[PDB]
Design a protein around this ligand. Structure first.
Ligand SMILES: *C(=O)/C=C/N[C@@H](C(=O)O)C(C)(C)S(=O)O
Length: 266
């Protein structure tokens, strides 16, 4: 059989472009499909963004209260838009940015990193520090979701983002306590039930961060644990750019790609 043929069939059936990377392990081959092609990050950047903030600061920094106004609310901020009066701590922002894809939380965390482009250069530099020379973040939320196809701004590749997530969750890019916090936030994500999680059987643990955007963009980056506790990183990226800027993102495409991946990792 050829798994690449089955990913090509998903592309045909969904009128989509699919990218997949599952890093090789001591026990498994890599899975790679369009893995070095660029795809918009969309909100998947929020996971390494939280890592960047954790990396740059002592854990006491999670208790720092960030204040902001209703004018700071960006598409879409399910948690921050209910705490304009109280503010939110850096830790609460990390929680919201990963678990609810909260865009104001991510923009405040970008600002916390500092520097030109409201933290986007800093974020890109953090990925460079992890050995990623391809990915780049150029815009804040929500504009980073809306670049036209072929524009390299705000893109990564499945290969790059998978190896970033590998280093962050399974590897030693972060000290183990900071790594635990990232992992726990991804483990309690609320936005991913219909994506990678939908493709892995219920006895596999799934932690993830989604992204969605223009041109039918739908992404999910996950770490999965088998029922025997063996971890894998699964990066699935998709768009439907042939359909135009308002092409519908298709979560099912990601669930079915994940099902094909689960099939070979079983
Ligand atoms: C992270 O993936 C954020 C995505 N945001 C977009 C989405 O499709 O959910 C919008 C449409 C909220 S943003 O206005 O592009």
């Amino acid at each position: 059989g050829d798994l690449a043929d089955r990913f090509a069939e998903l592309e045909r059936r969904y009128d989509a472009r699919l990218g997949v990377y599952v890093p090789a392990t001591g026990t498994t081959a890599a899975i790679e499909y369009r893995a070095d092609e660029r795809f918009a990050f969309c909100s998947t950047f929020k996971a390494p963004l939280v890592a960047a903030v954790l990396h740059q600061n002592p854990l006491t920094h999670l208790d720092k209260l960030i204040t902001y106004t209703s004018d700071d609310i960006r598409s879409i901020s399910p948690v921050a838009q209910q705490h304009v009066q109280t503010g939110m701590t850096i830790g609460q922002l990390c929680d919201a940015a990963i678990r609810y894809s909260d865009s104001t939380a991510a923009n405040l965390l970008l600002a916390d990193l500092g520097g030109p482009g409201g933290g986007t250069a800093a974020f890109t530099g953090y990925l460079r520090s992890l050995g990623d020379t391809v990915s780049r973040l150029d815009a804040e939320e929500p504009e980073l979701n809306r670049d036209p196809p072929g524009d390299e701004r705000d893109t990564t590749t499945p290969h790059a983002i998978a190896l970033v997530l590998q280093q962050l969750v399974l590897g030693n890019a972060l000290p183990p306590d900071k790594r635990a916090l990232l992992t726990d936030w991804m483990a309690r994500n609320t936005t991913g039930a219909k994506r990678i999680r939908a493709g892995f059987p219920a006895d596999w643990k799934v932690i993830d961060k989604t992204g969605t955007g223009d041109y039918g963009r739908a992404n999910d980056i996950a770490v999965v644990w088998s029922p025997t506790g063996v971890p894998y990183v699964v990066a699935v990226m998709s768009d439907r750019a042939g359909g135009g800027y308002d092409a519908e993102p298709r979560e099912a495409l990601l669930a079915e790609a994940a099902t094909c991946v689960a099939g070979v990792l079983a």
